[PDB]
Ligand binder design. Structure first.
Ligand code: GD3
Ligand code: GD3
Lengths: 202, 204
C-alpha cells in the first residue's frame, strides 16, 4: 500500500510557538510528491501534548463494561454537555509502559484492580494537528468492586464510575451518547470481538 | 414548563460556568486557555480551573463504500505529526475536509470526494460524529458512508494525494494489524465491518 517513508521527508526544522503545560510546535519540511518530485517548504502547526494509554474495563462473567464520567470543557462548544462517558486513561510519563500506565489509572480512576490485560489498538487522534497517540488495551475486571464519588474531590480529575452492560454501552456509541475517540474505538472493538474474548477469558 | 433534555451523564452545561478564555497563541490554528468552575460529584463547587485548548476547527469525514463490489476507496497522504510515533508519516485515510460557515457536513463530504478521490458520491448516510481528544482539543469530526462505484476511482490533488481501492475485508484487516491507525479511518472501518450486510441490503 503506502510507498514513501522517512527518507522521503526532510524536516528542515521545528520550533515551539507556545509552551505552558502543553506545547504547540511548528514543523517545517519538504517531501516526495506522488509524482516523484519534492515539495516546497511546507509548514504545519502541531499540538504536542504527549501520548496516551487507555484501558477498556471489561467484566467477562457479567458481560458488563465500567465507564468513567468527568468533565472536558473542550467538548463544550459542540456537545450538549462537557461531561463525558470515557474509558480509563492517563498520560504516559517518562519510561512507563502503556500496560502499567493503564493498570495504574484503573485503580486511581475507577478503583478497580485489573487482572489480565490484552492489547487492542493504537491510534492517532488526529494526524492533521496533533502528534498524540493512544494505545487502548482491554482489561479484565470485577464490575462489582468499582469505587464511588470522593468526598474530598480531585478537582483536576474528578470522576464518577458508571457500570452498564456491554450491549448497552455499545448502543450508546451507535446512538451518539458516547463520542470521544478512545471510547468509540475500544467499544467498537469489543462489539466485534467480545464472544471470542469471553471464551478466551473465564 | 418544557422538561429538561436527557443526559446519559450526571451534569449539564448549567453546572459549569466559563469565566473567560485568555489566548495563549494564535495562528491558523489557535491555542486558547479556558478558565472555569463546575460542580463536583460531591455536590460542591470547584475552585477555578485553567486548561489549554487546541482550537482546530471541525471536520467532515466520508467513507467511500461500494456495496455491490464490497470495496472501499482509500486516500494515501502525509501527516507529519505521525512522524515521531509511526514508521511513516504517510497514512491511509478517509475523505475529509474542514467545515466552515454556511457549509453542511454532507456538502464538504461530497465536495472533498471529488477533489481528493475523484469519485462521485451517490447516496450518503450519517454514520457517527466523534470528538478527537476532548482533553486538549475541541476538534469534532462527523462521519458518513458514501455510496460509491470503485471502478470510478481516479484527480486534482493526485500529486499530493494517492487513491487506493481495496476490498472491505482487506481494509479491516489493515486496521486489525495497524496499517490503518488514524482515528477517522479506524472508527469508520469498524463501524462498516459491523453494518455492511445491512448497508448492502439498504442500498441494494
Ligand atoms: Gd490520572
Ligand atoms: Gd479540500
Amino acid at each position: 500500500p503506502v510507498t514513501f517513508g522517512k527518507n522521503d521527508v526532510e524536516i528542515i526544522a521545528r520550533e515551539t510557538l507556545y509552551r505552558g503545560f502543553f506545547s504547540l510546535d511548528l514543523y517545517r519540511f519538504r517531501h516526495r510528491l506522488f509524482n516523484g518530485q519534492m515539495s516546497h517548504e511546507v509548514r504545519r502547526e502541531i499540538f504536542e501534548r504527549g501520548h496516551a494509554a487507555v484501558l477498556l474495563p471489561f467484566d467477562p462473567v457479567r458481560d458488563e463494561v465500567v465507564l468513567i464520567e468527568q468533565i472536558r470543557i473542550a467538548a463544550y462548544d459542540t456537545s450538549e454537555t462537557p461531561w463525558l462517558l470515557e474509558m480509563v486513561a492517563g498520560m504516559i510519563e517518562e519510561g512507563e509502559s502503556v500496560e502499567d500506565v493503564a493498570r495504574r489509572e484503573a485503580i486511581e480512576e475507577a478503583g478497580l484492580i485489573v487482572k489480565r490485560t490484552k492489547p487492542v489498538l493504537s491510534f492517532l487522534a488526529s494526524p492533521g494537528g496533533t502528534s498524540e497517540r493512544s494505545s487502548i488495551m482491554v482489561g479484565e475486571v470485577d464490575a462489582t468492586t468499582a469505587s464511588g464519588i470522593h468526598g474530598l474531590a480531585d478537582e483536576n480529575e474528578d470522576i464518577r464510575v458508571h457500570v452498564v452492560s456491554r450491549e448497552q454501552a455499545y448502543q450508546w456509541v451507535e446512538e451518539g451518547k458516547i463520542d470521544n475517540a478512545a471510547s468509540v474505538i475500544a467499544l467498537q472493538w469489543l462489539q466485534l470481538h467480545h464472544q471470542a474474548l469471553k471464551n478466551e477469558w473465564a
